[model samples]
Target: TSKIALFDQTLIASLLQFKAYKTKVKLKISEQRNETSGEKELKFEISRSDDFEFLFSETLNNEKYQILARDHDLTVDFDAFPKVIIQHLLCKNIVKNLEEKPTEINIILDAEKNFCSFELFSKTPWSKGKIFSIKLHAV
Candidate 1:
């Protein structure tokens, strides 16, 4: 099957069989280098709060904030990041790149952890330093 969607689409599948039902699917989005300064600290982590609801957390200097999404329409602390933009980045940009190549970035056979990852440089042009790497794991 060459079709695709977010790691969440698989997260929906992971919920079916796992170690113990399932904890949450962890999705991390990080900016690799801020315009080439190297190693950007600000990153975002989106985790499953449930089957439908999710928890979006952002970190800077390891300082993290959590937000509840009735559907990504909520704010965390400082500036509110719209879930829609994030989804557009993932669905249209990041995830889109995942399928264009052949990689077995899926779950682990140990059943301890299941994951998939990719970069922003794929399906989109590397503009500025918005270049990012994203990964998701079910644990």
Candidate 2:
């Protein structure tokens, strides 16, 4: 199956079960093409739950991607993409501060490359700890 299909069946499905913290979610998608090289790119962002966000972008590279996670002072990278990989990893960290989930989560693209960066932050006074970060790359 395709990575997009896997993501929809797994992560998206899992997230759908939760009651969103916000009434409306934000979504953005863009594409650009290089005339000389005939290269195409796609970027998308989905922000939901008041504290959950996901961003993805690539140079139309046939759907190969990777995921990375950072917590406290540790960072981990995955060489493969699985159906529920993101959901599992994110939940693992979210459970830690169940009492006060992050106030905002952002996924952005790297300036130097087409890497998807994930970040989490809690602005609430109850949880002003370190930010959680994750980066996704094309394999």
Candidate 3:
């Protein structure tokens, strides 16, 4: 299980700016998985228009799927913020000395409005993963 906490006021403020009419937002996520045969990769993109409409697309195992949320309005509530708990098999990793293990990723968005940080951990000490950061930009 993985948990994420969002406490940075500036980052929250930046998210609030999306409430304005006609603002465009873009999100890109990528992950790498180690497999018995080789390595697998996954990537996805999410775009939101000022009207709160969203378009989500992802490519998995060379297959692509897209979803358009034109009728659904995207809304953000800061009141529900501070802590968010996410539980599931976030990813799998096969390290040099460790057996195939399940990994959980916890993300924490700092003051940087354009970037965020993430931490990866697992059950076994050998499964201890690394910490990486990503950037989010307005398109």
Candidate 4:
């Protein structure tokens, strides 16, 4: 089982200065199976931080699926902060880019604002499986 998280709409409006790049997300999962029932329960969590964060949790019950990809929208440049972090994670082998079809996607904000941090995560690197959270914050 695994858990994930990301920013909220309110925070999206706050990051107008930092153009956010839609990066492919990946999640690490752990599984427990019961041979007698042929059933399994997947689980995970994102640490709650006062620094600014939240989530959109969803579970996978034996079916393969993508999490809340269409729901996320970037409202600012984020000065490449989002992309840099994601790329950096990729470099560190902490994340992998899954959506090869789209090289880069930009976040669109209706208004200008500033936020402290914005993050997105998944049960798997490819934005597939259960969703843990979609969090936001201010500095």
Clashing residue pairs in all predictions, respectively, total 0, 0, 0, 30
TM-scores for all candidates: the values are 0.23, 0.28, 0.24, 0.24
Off by over 4 Å in 1: 1-62, 65-79, 82-84, 87-122, 125-131, 134-138
Ranking by lDDT: 2, 1, 4, 3
lDDT of 2 by residue, 1-139 (tens): 1113222211121121124232233433344444565444333344444544343433332222222232344233222222134444345445333222223544444455346554445455686543445444533
Against the true structure, candidate 3 reaches a TM-score of: 0.24
C-alpha RMSD of each candidate structure in angstroms: 14.5, 11.1, 18.3, 13.9
Cα error of candidate 1 at position 69, Å:
20
Clashing residue pairs, backbone N/CA/C < 3 A, model 1: none
Model 4 misplacement above 4 A: 1-28, 32-38, 51-53, 64-139
Model 2, backbone clash pairs (residues 3+ apart or across chains), number? 0
Off by over 4 Å in 2: 1-103, 126-128
Best by TM-score: 2
Q: Lowest summed-lDDT stretch of 10 residues in model 2? A: 8-17
State the lDDT at 138 in candidate 4.
20
lDDT of 1 at 103: 23
**Candidate 1 lDDT (Cα, 0 to 1):** 0.35
Model 3 regions more than 4 Å off:
1-103, 131-139
lDDT of each: 0.35, 0.38, 0.30, 0.31
Cα deviation at 114, candidate 2, in Å, is: 2.3
lDDT: worst 10-residue window of model 3: 5-14
